């Protein structure tokens, strides 16, 4: 696990053989990570939309471990002010909002 | 409630005598709402920081009802692509991330 929100909900993740930190972000539809080199196929995706769009590489069905939970989901790779775990992967880990 | 994240976590809020909808956003530090007229004192605040800054009006200790929970917290008022409930108010309602 239960994570309170007095601080930013940053967790440890393992992706592409690396250890990283990322923010559990219920306001984000998608997961965006920078400085990861993933193997296998990708296609460009345009995201954002305020001020222009940002182009990232979309990798599908990426194995990723989030705070000890080994899951699979789409990961967008490109420059991001902070690494973000979006709803797409929070559903996979069974993460809910509770009050 | 327990809210799953397959869809955007949009909830009903009551603020300044009005009924609105807003996104429960764990990636946002602050709560930003548009098209509300709040009574009492405010001060300008600069937020964002990508491409420039956005100036909003900061109202402190604002009574707000979020999904049935009457709480108090800072509300920033200004144009926002989507009304956002940030961690500052999610802590007030006792909202946690669970998995």
């Amino acid at each position: 696990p239960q994570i309170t929100l007095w601080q930013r909900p940053i967790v440890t993740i393992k992706i592409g053989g690396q250890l990283k930190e990322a923010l559990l972000n219920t306001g984000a539809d998608d997961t965006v990570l920078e400085e990861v080199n993933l193997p296998g196929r990708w296609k460009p995706k345009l995201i954002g939309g305020i001020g222009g769009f940002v182009k990232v590489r979309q990798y599908d069905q990426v194995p990723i471990e989030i705070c000890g939970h080994k899951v699979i989901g789409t990961v967008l790779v490109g420059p991001t002010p902070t690494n973000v775990i979006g709803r797409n992967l929070m559903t996979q880990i069974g993460c809910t909002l509770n009050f | 409630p327990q809210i799953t994240l397959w869809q955007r976590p949009i909830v009903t809020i009551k603020i300044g005598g009005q009924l609105k909808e807003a996104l429960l956003n764990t990636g946002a530090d602050d709560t930003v709402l548009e098209e509300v007229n709040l009574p009492g004192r405010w001060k300008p605040k600069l937020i964002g920081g990508i491409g420039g800054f956005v100036k909003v009006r900061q109202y402190d200790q604002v009574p707000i009802e979020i999904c049935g929970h009457k709480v108090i917290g800072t509300v920033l008022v200004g144009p926002t692509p989507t009304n956002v409930i940030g961690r500052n108010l999610m802590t007030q309602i006792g909202c946690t991330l669970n998995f």
């Binding site: 306001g27 984000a28 998608d30 769009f53 002010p81 973000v84 | 990636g27 946002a28 692509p81």
Partner: peptide, 7 residues
């Protein structure tokens, strides 16, 4: 740094 996001 409030965040959110789409695309």
């Amino acid at each position: 740094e409030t965040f959110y996001v789409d695309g």
